[PDB]
């Protein structure tokens with residue numbers, strides 16, 4: 379079969395190459411980063427709802443969920459936030475990814491560290507510290523649900539995927555050495571340590 383691939387621009391490639399090919403001890407920061415993006419996405423739709431309450435539609439509860447899958451060996455971070463359009467995905471948020479990436483790479487070279495990734499709005503890329511493949515399912519009110527996928531290596535795909543009423547689901551396929559992010563105690567301790575700074579409830583899926 380045939381697949382259609384988009385190419386990451388130079389900046390994103392440089393950042394991903396750094397994240398993937400360099401040893402970093404504090405990989406655990408990825409969770410906080412993904413939860414930060416979710417909280418910001420909830421804020422955007424919440425800001426829109428202030429003038430027009432119908433933007434929330436059938437999904438009023440603005441929530442962040444952390445869901446491990448021990449069978450498929452994946453970690454999901456989902457939200458009922460603003461969501462992303464085909465355009466946001468195809469373009470990789472365009473200028474915001476390139477600007478954040480140039481400034482972050484600059485910060486790193488000048489004394490900044492990987493833990494500061496989120497301060498540059500590029501925190502999503504920290505997923506690549508623990509994941510070998512990242513799948514981003516998203517749905518915005520103005521568009522249909524689409525799936526962004528990248529195993530890095532300069533390319534990504536954006537496929538039409540119905541259907542998540544509004545928001546984003548980020549599925550991380552964890553690396554063999556990163557299976558600790560499937561353990562309940564690990565995720566609990568990490569989510570608790572960060573929930574104190576997130577203005578939305580963070581749901582962790584627990585093992586029955």
Ligand SMILES: CC1(C)CC(=O)c2c(C(F)(F)F)nn(-c3ccc(C(N)=O)c(N[C@H]4CC[C@@H](O)CC4)c3)c2C1
Pocket residue numbers: 415416418419422457459460461462466467470471472474475476478499500501502503514526546548
């Ligand atoms: C498009 C991506 C697949 C690839 C990308 O590059 C990238 C970046 C960037 F690096 F650009 F900043 N950030 N980023 C990302 C990742 C999680 C979310 C969330 N869970 O909502 C998100 N929300 C944007 C929705 C649009 C905005 O108006 C407001 C918040 C963005 C992604 C996901």
